[PDB]
Design a protein around this ligand. Sequence first.
Ligand SMILES: NC(=O)c1ccc[n+]([C@@H]2O[C@H](COP(=O)([O-])OP(=O)(O)OC[C@H]3O[C@@H](n4cnc5c(N)ncnc54)[C@H](OP(=O)(O)O)[C@@H]3O)[C@@H](O)[C@H]2O)c1
Ligand SMILES: CCCCC1C(=O)N(c2ccccc2)N(c2ccccc2)C1=O
Ligand SMILES: CCCCC1C(=O)N(c2ccccc2)N(c2ccccc2)C1=O
Ligand SMILES: CCCCC1C(=O)N(c2ccccc2)N(c2ccccc2)C1=O
Length: 348
Amino acid sequence: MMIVQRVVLNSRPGKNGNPVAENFRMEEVYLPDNINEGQVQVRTLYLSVDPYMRCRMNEDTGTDYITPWQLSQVVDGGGIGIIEESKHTNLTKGDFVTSFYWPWQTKVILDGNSLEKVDPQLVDGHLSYFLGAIGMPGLTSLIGIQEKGHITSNKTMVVSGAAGACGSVAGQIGHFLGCSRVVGICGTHEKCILLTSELGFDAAINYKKDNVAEQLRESCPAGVDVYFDNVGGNISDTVISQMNENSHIILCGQISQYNKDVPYPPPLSPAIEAIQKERNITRERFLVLNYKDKFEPGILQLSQWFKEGKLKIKETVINGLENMGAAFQSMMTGGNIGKQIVCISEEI
Ligand SMILES: NC(=O)c1ccc[n+]([C@@H]2O[C@H](COP(=O)([O-])OP(=O)(O)OC[C@H]3O[C@@H](n4cnc5c(N)ncnc54)[C@H](OP(=O)(O)O)[C@@H]3O)[C@@H](O)[C@H]2O)c1
Ligand SMILES: CCCCC1C(=O)N(c2ccccc2)N(c2ccccc2)C1=O
Ligand SMILES: CCCCC1C(=O)N(c2ccccc2)N(c2ccccc2)C1=O
Ligand SMILES: CCCCC1C(=O)N(c2ccccc2)N(c2ccccc2)C1=O
């Protein structure tokens, strides 16, 4: 048997704690030499890190559709790989495949029925895009905007988490689908420049260093019609206060709250909820997995926009399975521009 590397959950940060690289531990394990009928042996190429993973580090995730990671057991998440051996009738050696529950391990034996075969032509061979802009975050942005944005209209969109995986795509799609103005809120001036100089955002606001309320008044002079919310907390309170009658909050995530012992989705404060109700602002829970029937058209559209040169795809790649923990910590504290990716093998 050959020896491979895996990542297991080492320790929990606590419900109110910050996640750190040391919450994960690398181990070496044997990979069995044979696979059974219906299984495939896959070489892991890229793995995702994602904000939802924070709740998987707690003993109770607080959400009925996410299971907690278990101490000393292999971690899992979005991944893409290449089939090395197959005893599944619909998969063969050399196929590229994806799973939402890919073990954090360099080579894996999986049930073939749990994988989706993907076409590398859709990403011009850049496979890591299947974990970002031509993957779940891209789909979340496109389907979120389509289903919850009510964009036809010379509307103004605000995007929080604007320079992240979802946000960087959302702001571009807002322009593609008819917003006249798209304004981004993010955590660094470097990110602000990216948004306006490369991604076509009309304005960018650094929430750490800028006065968010007054910058939104200057950059959104006609108020806010659509809010693509990745962050929640005080930032969302500030945006909501400038939202128009009959506007829409695309409630994508609330990452400002993930290191706190509070339920998801978190309620708005009494003052901000009052504004929401008075202005008839809609704020419905959005779960991209409720729209799996739209993933095909979504991916095909994201791909087409990419290939046309319209959709600009940004990512931050760290190399090596040993860096999964560091990549997660980095993403959670804003180290990533666009999608955080970990490259697990050589790009061939
Ligand atoms: N509803 C769904 O089906 C669905 C699907 C996918 C993702 N989501 C949600 O979408 C959001 C974005 O996920 P992603 O994968 O695109 O991650 P991401 O935006 O690429 O990475 C997270 C970013 O969050 C920002 N951040 C971290 N802590 C913050 C804080 N306290 N306040 C403000 N910003 C903070 C950081 O950028 P800064 O430098 O700008 O702080 C960091 O780069 C998350 O809330 C996630 O749960 C939802
Ligand atoms: C409690 C986290 C809040 C937003 C959250 C969500 O419900 N999903 C989410 C939806 C269904 C199953 C699992 C998570 N994911 C998510 C992350 C990456 C890709 C897709 C969805 C999210 O980040
Ligand atoms: C997308 C890859 C497979 C994920 C699959 C799943 O595990 N959950 C899921 C997780 C736990 C319990 C039930 C389903 N749901 C799901 C569907 C809609 C909304 C939320 C989750 C899914 O679609
Ligand atoms: C949450 C994942 C559950 C399976 C899921 C998948 O990963 N892809 C999928 C593959 C690559 C990127 C994003 C999703 N698609 C999918 C996409 C387009 C057409 C058919 C299927 C899927 O339905």
